[PDB]
Design a protein around this ligand. Structure first.
Ligand SMILES: Cc1cc(F)ccc1CS(N)(=O)=O
Ligand SMILES: [Zn+2]
Ligand SMILES: [Zn+2]
Ligand SMILES: [Zn+2]
Length: 459
């Protein structure tokens, strides 16, 4: 049961206003035929245009909400809306485009999907709240057949060109006019009461209904993200490497060790309260401090209320020492904290738009993250960049320019001249730091944190 059987039943009630008289008894096999596509008993990698909820979740990076609204049905213009915010008007003859024939609309769809998806996925999954017009419009810009490879590379084909009779992936599709072998899922098949807007608005206030097709497309995809990543969470699902995932994760571990080690050296806290991932390990294993762990899985819906994490009767005294919240998202951090908080507003290939201001951060696993909120950090300050090292000044073993920097907290810098080892390590650390920040992570610390307190650790 890897793929969705074409003989599975499709509920047609949501389609009967656009398609009156539609049979109640319907399979994906008959629906695909009604849509004008012919499968031809083909076991060549494309068993069904529609996919299961499980297959959709594995391909969340490919999700593109799609809605079609009748402007005036073969005789009337259609408004094609996508979760990218694009609206195209196709004539049968929040970016809005004037009425144009299908032969040119299809070229724009291919360009838009290719630019949106080339750095995200090997395919497209059209996320629908199917009412009819969207399914009957697909024959005008979609071609199907056996699974194919790109004419210029080894990636699977996502586009077809009627001009050259060739196939291309999202990276090599310039000038292509048909979407080839797309996938799709109808959110209405999951069991819902009432319309799209009423279900969407139960969980989200950030997307409105400006009464255009792209608004519906955005709400449809937001509702699907809510159902699959907020109300239901699966950390077993692995996602492929598409960018700097490995460097980002390594940078996060390097920064965590640095910041916590320096906070413990600078303020000598007798106890550290490590709140968050139940599989956390001590990030500064050689530190003297009493290390106490508190389990909290990553919150996917709303940030944790500090009152619920700390109260209702553990050291009990979280006010003693320091609290470490490494990606443990709370409504208001206590004043004695060290925090790493993902900024959902960051633009990247790893960060997808999410539900109610949240974002879906996909890096090995999918993490729906509640909306970034500057008021969570009112008791703290931004953690400035610094590099600290107590390791010996010794090279061992890449050409050099002498390092001069007030933030290189080492014995050699205290002595007036940064050594080659500490200059190389500082530059590698700065690159790791910049990688983590650019990925969207933000760092915050208790207001008394002062790197001037690190210089006396060199006695
Ligand atoms: C974005 C992110 C990355 C990560 F590695 C761990 C957690 C989070 C945020 S959370 N706890 O809301 O899922
Ligand atoms: Zn290619
Ligand atoms: Zn929404
Ligand atoms: Zn040195």
């Amino acid at each position: 049961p890897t793929h969705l059987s074409v003989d599975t039943k499709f509920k047609t009630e949501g389609l009967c206003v656009d398609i009156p008289g539609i049979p109640k008894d319907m399979t994906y096999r008959r629906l695909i035929s009604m849509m004008g596509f012919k499968m031809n008993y083909q076991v060549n990698g494309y068993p069904n245009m529609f996919i299961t909820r499980e297959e959709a979740i594995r391909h969340v990076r490919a999700w593109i909400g799609f809605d079609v609204e009748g402007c005036h049905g073969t005789n009337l213009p259609l408004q094609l809306g996508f979760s990218t915010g694009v609206n195209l008007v196709a004539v049968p003859t929040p970016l809005m485009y004037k009425g144009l024939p299908w032969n040119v609309v299809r070229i724009k769809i291919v360009q838009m999907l290719s630019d949106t998806l080339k750095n995200l996925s090997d395919r497209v999954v059209f996320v629908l709240w199917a009412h009819g017009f969207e399914l009957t419009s697909m024959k005008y810009f979609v071609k199907i057949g056996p699974e194919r490879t790109c004419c210029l590379c080894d990636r699977r084909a996502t586009c077809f060109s009627t001009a050259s009779d060739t196939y291309a992936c999202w990276h090599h599709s310039i000038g292509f006019d048909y979407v080839y072998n797309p996938f799709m899922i109808d959110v209405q098949q999951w069991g819902f009461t009432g319309n799209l807007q009423s279900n969407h608005d139960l969980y989200c206030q950030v997307h409105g209904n400006a009464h255009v097709a792209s608004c519906d497309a955005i709400m449809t995809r937001c509702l699907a993200v809510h159902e699959c990543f907020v109300k239901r969470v699966d950390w077993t699902i692995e996602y492929p490497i598409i960018g700097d995932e490995l460097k980002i994760n390594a940078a996060c571990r390097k920064v965590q060790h640095m910041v916590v080690k320096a906070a413990l050296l600078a303020d000598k806290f007798p106890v550290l309260h490590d709140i968050g991932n139940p599989k956390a390990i001590k990030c500064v294993p050689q530190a003297d401090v009493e290390w106490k762990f508190y389990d909290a899985q990553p919150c996917s819906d709303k940030a944790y209320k500090i009152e619920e994490l700390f109260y209702s009767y553990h050291s009990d005294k979280f006010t003693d020492g320091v609290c470490l919240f490494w990606n443990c998202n709370v409504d208001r951090y206590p004043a004695n904290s060290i925090v790493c908080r993902f900024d959902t507003r960051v633009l990247s290939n790893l960060n997808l738009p999410g539900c109610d201001g949240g974002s879906l951060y996909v890096n090995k696993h999918a993490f729906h993250t509640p909306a970034f909120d500057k008021s969570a950090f009112v008791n703290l300050k931004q953690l400035p960049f610094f590099y600290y090292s107590d390791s010996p000044c010794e090279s061992h073993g890449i050409d050099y320019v002498p390092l001069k920097s007030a933030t290189c907290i080492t014995r050699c810098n205290l002595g007036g001249a940064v050594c080659r080892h500490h200059a190389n390590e500082y530059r590698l650390y700065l690159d790791a730091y910049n990688m983590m920040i650019s990925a969207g992570f933000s760092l915050w610390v208790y207001k008394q944190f002062d790197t001037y307190n690190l210089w006396n650790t060199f006695t």
